[PDB]
Symmetry: D2
Subunit: 76 residues, 4 copies
């Protein structure tokens, strides 16, 4: 949905699974400074103070972004 | 609770109930141009293209806003 | 990019070009408030409550900041 | 207010004041992209993907726009 992480291999921003997006976005809305999530057993932490995702198995750091919708909304 | 409506009587922005905030925020995230909700004995439409809430019983209009959290977050 | 709500017309209204520039400059500088005048009336915008206040009467009208989509559409 | 991500250090990095101003001026004017130079390096920032492209090598560096809280907090 609205969070993305950048894949350096493909050179593209990528969406999370619905479940992981909801876990991240819920922690964002609750004021937490970081959040843990998994893809299967693979562990990750998103650090909101640096906007980086840390792969907790390889240590690789990928940037994250929060997409923003226009305000006000455009007419259809 | 990230949506707010302005109360001209008190001069303050006000929160929605958790459930009404969720209805509004779910329609916002889904790309809808407006959303209806019920609070007490009144039905309201939030018009996202104008950022105004309309009381459908009386026609009264109140402005709305979406709060935004800082990016990046502070330590 | 800044607007104030006019309850008489029931609509958000744009600020004048100069008032918009004055308000947006203070916003970007991290200030908590900014002064301006319109129609020979003195106002303060309070960014911590997102309202404009008539300094003589105390009347509060809400303000909003338009936001651009991120990413941008093609 | 604009930042680019450095995959070597794993950190977001600031632009020079002049390059930040070039990027932000194009952002505010509705452009879909903007070119800038830093020394011998030549880049395009693509706002539709939030990526900076090195015009010589094609290397992609993600970019971000910092966002100030609304409403603002008291000091
Ligand atoms: N940003 C603005 N830009 C242009 N016009 C504005 C703005 N803000 C308000 N106005 C207009 O400014 C006018 C006043 O709104 P207000 O400054 O809030 O103060 P009050 O409501 O206590 O009215 C104060 C006195 O003015 C009258 O004679 C009344 O009888 C009062 O005696 C409205 O027309 C607004 O649309
Ligand atoms: Cl990268
Ligand atoms: Cl990895
Ligand atoms: Cl009402
Ligand atoms: Cl004005
Ligand atoms: Cl590069």
């Amino acid at each position: 949905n609205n969070w993305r992480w950048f894949d350096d291999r493909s050179g593209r921003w990528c969406s999370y699974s619905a479940s992981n997006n909801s876990t991240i976005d819920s922690a964002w809305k609750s004021g937490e400074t970081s959040v843990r999530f998994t893809a299967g057993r693979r562990r990750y932490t998103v650090q909101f103070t640096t906007m980086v995702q840390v792969n907790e198995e390889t240590g690789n750091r990928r940037p994250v972004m929060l997409t923003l919708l226009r305000v006000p909304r455009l007419n259809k």
